[model samples]
Target chain A: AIAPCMQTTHSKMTAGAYTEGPPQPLSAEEKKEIDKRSVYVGNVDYGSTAQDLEAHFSSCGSINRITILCDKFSGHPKGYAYIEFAERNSVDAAVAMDETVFRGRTIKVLPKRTNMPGISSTDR
Target chain B: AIAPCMQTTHSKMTAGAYTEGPPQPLSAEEKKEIDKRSVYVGNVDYGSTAQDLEAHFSSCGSINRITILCDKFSGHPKGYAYIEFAERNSVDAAVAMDETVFRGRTIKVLPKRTNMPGISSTDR
Candidate 1:
């Protein structure tokens, strides 16, 4: 399970600068598209299983791919994940749901970005 | 200059599960391909300046874009960065110099992945 996070728009206008950078992870709208086929999630709760996500998103439609990013060493949650839905209509419904009522968690849903933020981890 | 960490091969055998991921950041090989275009870096040393990286890789060719990921709050380097060269051949030359001999740092050359490791940050 990933941590539950709120979507941020502070840097939305930067377009690949000091912000998260270009080729971002899925966007709210893009997630809507991915949801048509998948949902890229972040800030999920720890220990959340694929089944947990499947059961949670199933209301929207059938899931084709459910992956919960995890720590390679600990097997704990990495706090983000992705899910693919078989039907675009189901994806539409899931986006509308937008964590409105899902197992005590208000999850943020977006499209799967080919690139994710914070992975760069520069020190200097 | 990013952290000069070692790349892991343990998970290369597995495509998706129990591995870092399918939607993985740029690969060493992919970086090779990306070197054909640009270089996405991570795990860099603290205090690495764009000029420092440019100077470091200048042997390969001219640098075009050098982005140092920064903290929105502090403006400090985020421990990762990306550099784009004018020519892919320059990227190749720079990649050839991968860790061969550079100021105190052994940098890795790889393509920029749209997705990265450890951004999910999940907790139970």
Candidate 2:
């Protein structure tokens, strides 16, 4: 549910001083570089698997791939997943699926921020 | 998901010094006074009406009554509701309906805490 061209402030630019200006908007080229067909799923249960995601989201559209991030050493899921759809229209349906619960956990479906260069994690 | 016979802490008994001890369990008579067929619905969207809740929860069981808490002065919903079912078995089905999404908001279904004498808001 991020608004397009949203601005945020950051104080961690230089060692002593902070950059106090509004963050820049995404350029047309940068926006085009972002994979709009993908949706970021947050608040996923650690036990949930890629197959579960695919089975659940397949109703929206044809899922191209489902990636559940995991720790390098522990091999435990990071409680989030990325789902890429075959069609761009499926992204809208996926985004509308926010607040859908799975395995007693409510998940957030958001537009994937693939290459958003300026926005920081705080702003997101 | 509350553990039956759970204890809580309440310090408002006497005037000055707080008497800290585990709260007493609900007596059998006190438990019987509580409508076991009802559930407490929390985190409801403010704009959602009683009809919306009924329509959404109808799949779980037969709803005897739906009471959306509201501000006495403003006449607006207080973001929580009490749903009474016709059968005691429906309470189990209703509890299982926890985390079910309704109107883009994830609502919590809990056993109704009517006339809970000792437990405070913090404990709940």
Candidate 3:
């Protein structure tokens, strides 16, 4: 009954200081390491700012980062975000809060993975 | 970013099955068995289907069912899947195969209890 995109509009990534030249892509193992501390928060309020997220999610643990997805061309919030904590325990803490109210929206907090989805040759 | 609204969906339930009041939740023992047998598979090949996954993991044990995570809204694969075995012992072998290359790419196998397990994370 269902299946899953060109993610060009939302190349999910970490927020970092402006770097020179093309940045190095993370290897699979590195992605998994970061994913250990990352959680996907969805159904967010479009107006919910990253600062709001950091403050709210702070209850779980010290946040390493929070990335609210934004439109690459339109520059608008995507109503979904990724949060990273310094420890794996924070991920467990965050996952426990799934299906909770956040900024007037019922949000889903699920573990995040770093692998990019590929277009299936059969899908064509 | 999309919701399952009459399209792009999948489920373990049959269609039009009328429900009464509250749905019947899994029993503690049933949940335990499922928890022990289920494994979350990430970094899957987009072209891979439940059949492909089951066939590949056949050596681990008898597969009861498998669900590749799909775009709940777009109905495309999210590059991850879940496999449930008929025998709890199989889960061990499944997790042991973590980081084992499949279709030329290493996959991530994790205990399914750590995840929501339901087909769509976007069901928020």
Candidate 4:
């Protein structure tokens, strides 16, 4: 579900920087618990808005929050988003929809699978 | 400064999971200072080790540390590494060595260019 645009050398190179950083999440437990109910959505169209995501994923569960990441400098969607569901049970429902198409692009739906908040080694 | 292997679809898919996490570093400033003195080295052979990196990058300056990231699950080098130089000025020296060949592979050397420690957006 990754966006094709990120297929450059940059992503692979940056993994180490984060990998070596202390892999801790925000403070402690609460955030970890919140992450469990979240699902990461990728391969999104840069044009997709929060409303679009809510409308599309509403079938899975009630959404607590839906955020499409944006570049701090560019002020544009970063081609990915996150959906925090009111119930953790929704994570599985969303993840089951992996490889589903949205707005003409195939999107990957994965459990937010909380890790020790370090740079994700999944880059490689 | 990324590896070719990272060009795969998985890297693109995982960025969001890390991006939306709390983007902070290990209690801050100290890590940022160290990062400036470092350069991320990518496109490494999967067999490369910390020692291999140091021996190859010795010309940049005295090395404080050299780390070749390994997959936590697989315990194999992830084809990328980070070189921490004793002197911050050495960062430019190492970065200048970007695109140089080592052990028959073209490696990318770039400033550690520290940012908020979350999933890196450079993938896209």
Candidate 5:
């Protein structure tokens, strides 16, 4: 799965000025889909299953869904997951658990950002 | 910047058990490189600059360096930064500032994970 690092060749005009431009603005429809009741959990242990996360998060509040993102090819967990709650208030509790040790790893829990390409809030 | 979603084609043998297996074990070197004195900052507004982060993080402690990761192709920010501190104590302060609104975005601050490929602590 290791693709050769692409040569960073660029147009002469853009050379030396590679500073990233302004951030892309999210559209109304895009912003509307970022579920307020969901939290993005990162650094998940690959061995842990959805059930593990579900059990841990259920104590916080009602969980509607738990999705562990994985590589489309290798089927490996991408070290992250999205937990949607039945109640929006549960999102706060989930976030409060940020950096809590889980499976010997301190997991990062934050509000899911739906701005990534191909990831829509309602897609789940 | 849009790539077609790859069909999640997989072998039938692993179909139902597509659950991500155990987490990838980090090498001792990798663990050592994850500077305890630094913090991983994500959800950075693309418009923000390293200087902006330095100015803000300076309040926490002595600043060492700042790196804002960007796409190799489009040179656009991937929405994160790595802030290293001269004093490890500053890490606690930076982590405390988690969820703080900065430039209209609630930025995330956590300890840097050096497990990612090509991201070495000494690379900076």
Candidate 6:
């Protein structure tokens, strides 16, 4: 019924200025501490499986967790995936993989978008 | 000043089988009729204002309305928008504009995702 549809999408940072969130502003040291932790990757292959993704990134080092958005019906790729690493050093190595073509697509790598409760309001 | 940012995105039917809708399957005639009306346009500039969008789609004919999703804070483009035509014939003309490179971006066209009530549960 369907064939392999591999389309590449470029992942770019969401533009526009940063918004004020939970008042705990980070000090320079705190900012460094946060940056020293995780890395965000986007422009993922919608059809790529999470297991395969974990293995792909694991080639560099250990991965702590991976999240893939699934379609309710087919439970297949919707073309976006996320990965978390066990350490900051591993993340630096992963960012180096930015714009690296995988699964017939150019993947985007950057600091992950965190959805912490206090960060942004859920607006309709 | 920030340079104008333009990127193209392809819009197609969300992968997966259609879920339970409000207990109504459109007859083939209904499907055909629906297709005759309301074209879905995608891959719009994140920076385009709602008025600009209305003007863009209005070229075809009378436009009922246009909606642009906004960021909570900066209230800027989220890279997607919707347009509704006053007549089905106008919609047919709009769909023909699919993949037409506009503002250095390739836009995709298809039927709009009708989010009518009882169509699908809001699965979190």
Give the top-scoring candidate (DockQ): 4
Model 3 spans > 4 angstroms off: A1-124, B1-23, B72-77, B114-124
- Which window of 10 residues has the lowest lDDT sum in candidate 6 chain B? B14-23
lDDT of each: 0.48, 0.53, 0.55, 0.56, 0.55, 0.47
Off by over 4 Å in 6: A1-124, B1-36, B70-77, B118-124
Candidate 4 residues A13-124, lDDT tens each? 3233423332222344444555678887876665554444655777787675444443312233244566767678787788899888877778888876565444765345
lDDT (tens digit, per residue) of candidate 2 on B1-124: 7442533312111111112111123465443433477777776675554445555666677765444432212233234566666667777788887788877878788777444444545332
For model 3, how does the per-residue alpha-carbon lDDT over A21-123 read when each residue is reduced to its tens digit? 1122456655455567888787666555454565577789866544443221123323456676767888889989989987666888877753433453423
The sequence of per-residue lDDT tens digits that candidate 4 reaches over residues B5-103 is 654332222222224334322334544565678787765654454445566777668665443332211222234456767688788788887767776
Number of the predicted model whose lDDT against the real structure is largest: 4
Better of 3 and 6 by DockQ: 6
Q: Which stretches of candidate 5 lie over 4 Å from their true place?
A: A1-124, B1-34, B72-77, B115-124
Candidate 2 docking classification: incorrect
Better by TM-score, candidate 3 or 2: 3
The C-alpha stretches of model 4 lying farther than 4 A from their native spots are A1-28, A71-78, A115-124, B1-124
TM-score of 6: 0.33
Model 2 clash pairs?
Answer: none
The local lDDT score (0 to 100) that residue A34 gets in candidate 6 is: 46
Of candidates 4 and 1, the better by lDDT: 4
TM-scores, one per candidate: 0.31, 0.32, 0.36, 0.37, 0.33, 0.33
